[model samples]
Target: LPDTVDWREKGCVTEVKYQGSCGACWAFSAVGALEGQLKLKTGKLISLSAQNLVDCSNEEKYGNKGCGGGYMTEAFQYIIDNGGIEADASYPYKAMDEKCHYNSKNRAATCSRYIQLPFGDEDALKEAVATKGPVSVGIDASHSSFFFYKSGVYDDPSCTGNVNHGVLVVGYGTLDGKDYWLVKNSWGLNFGDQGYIRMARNNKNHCGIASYCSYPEI
Candidate 1:
């Protein structure tokens, strides 16, 4: 396997977007993973609608909490059960949770299935990213250091707990002898290093980066 991988460089990643004040990071994370799969399968990059999940995925039973936060695994299942995800141009993001206006005809991409990596396993996570397109992984984003992270590998020891936020693991590499996982956040381009954070990798799965990781199969 390669030592590093970045779906962004391979044209499989879309631009960094904002999620505003909503706890809709899970929606963005799930959509981002599927978007990467769509690009790899069709050789075209399309921005899938995160609003679809935010509004529709909350089905009462096995449903995500929409803007109130959710699980990437549950989001993937919702996408598969709902046929597919619509384009952002059609269902545009409203940030806040609203009614589901999912248009089947406007679905730009669909997922065949999803695979969850082993818990707390960085090796499996790295392998999946290097071969697969991109993986949606849950992490602990409750730490203030993480919220104010600007650059360099984020290794805040205090950042540990049950996964409360979701993000995409688009790539992994070494920086000045320190290994890092290139994480894409939904806090807008003004957050982190333009909405990207190099999180410390292979370090006891810091922040639960490998706790609940999964990817859509296209």
Candidate 2:
């Protein structure tokens, strides 16, 4: 097993993306880390479709117009129930001011193969990682910089009211002489030191990312 690991050791860095005035933060975060995990394990940089989760997940209560946030676990459950699907070459990523245009035919194909990870417990997270690989997580990056970060290290203050974004934990590692976690992001490759951000290790509270963070394993 990978030694008793922490966030820093796991390299759980993340890439930030503006939900574009939309509430699709949850879906973006869901796919962000999933993309990272896939790259880490298979060494293949495959872009998963966040739209699939957005359009298909059974999150009526969370709002479907990408204006409201939902649970990452619920999104994963949708993927599991419907099976997973890979992003198509024709599918394009829509940024802010754009509307969601989902393809009815491109349904998820491997959703049922994934396993759910436990929430609220660091040991459970470590155990899930040991048993599976990387898992998806949701965070609350409602800080000012998180939404309008142009460049430089993320030194934003604590996120206050905003708490509706998603991200993935592909791996853990240390940096800047401190333990940290590696998280992948979907705000293109130019943001956050080339689509990556590092958080303090063993940050069970997700550094205030969100109190309801979760992931899925396959």
Candidate 3:
């Protein structure tokens, strides 16, 4: 495995997104992983639409709740079943819940299946991020430190194994001897390290970073 893997340097990661007051972090995370995979497969780094999944995948069978919450795996399945996902420019994010406006003509990327990393296994997560483009992960982001996270490895003592928010694990590396997973958030550019975070890695899956890790395969 490579000592460091940053998809941003490769232009595989899209711009940091904003979910507003909506609990649609899962859509962003799912779209982010698929976008990375599309970029890796083709030379085009198309920004897939999270809003499409937010609206179209928010059904009982898929386990998505529109602006409430969702699961990355189910989101992947939604894309697969729906033929593909649209480009962000075609189906821009509204942040709030909306009716499904899916169109197969605007499909920019497609996924056949997804791979879920072993539950609570940080080693498997790192390996996946190293080989795969980016992996969507769930973590406990209800803490104050996570909200005010600036620079440095985020190792909140109060953080627990409660995976609440979904985010993308784009890369992994060391920062001043502290191993960290370079994560991409959908809370806009003012959230963490310019819309990203260096969560403490290999610390017993701190904040449940690996609790529900998975990624789409295009």
Highest-lDDT candidate? 3
lDDT of 3 by residue, 66-150 (tens): 8989999999999989888999999999988899998888889999999998999988998899988899999999999999999
Every model's Cα RMSD, please? 0.9, 5.1, 0.8
Best by TM-score: 3
In terms of lDDT, the poorest run of 10 residues in model 2 is 6-15
User: Which stretches of model 3 miss by more than 4 angstroms?
Assistant: none
Local distance difference test, each candidate: 0.90, 0.53, 0.92
- If both were scored by TM-score, which would come out higher, candidate 2 or candidate 3? 3
* Candidate 2 lDDT score at position 112: 39
**Residue by residue across 1-218, what tens digits does model 1's lDDT show?**
78888888899999998999888898999999999999988997999999998999987765688888888888889888888889898999898989888889898998879998999999999999999878999999998899999998999989885778889999999998889999999999999999999999989989999999899997
Per-prediction TM-score, please? 0.97, 0.66, 0.98
Question: Model 2 over residues 110-194: C-alpha lDDT tens digits?
Answer: 4434455444555555565555555566556666666565443344447432445566655554555554555555655675655
lDDT comparison, 1 vs 3, better candidate:
3
Clash count of each predicted structure: 0, 33, 0
TM-score of 1: 0.97
lDDT of 2: 0.53
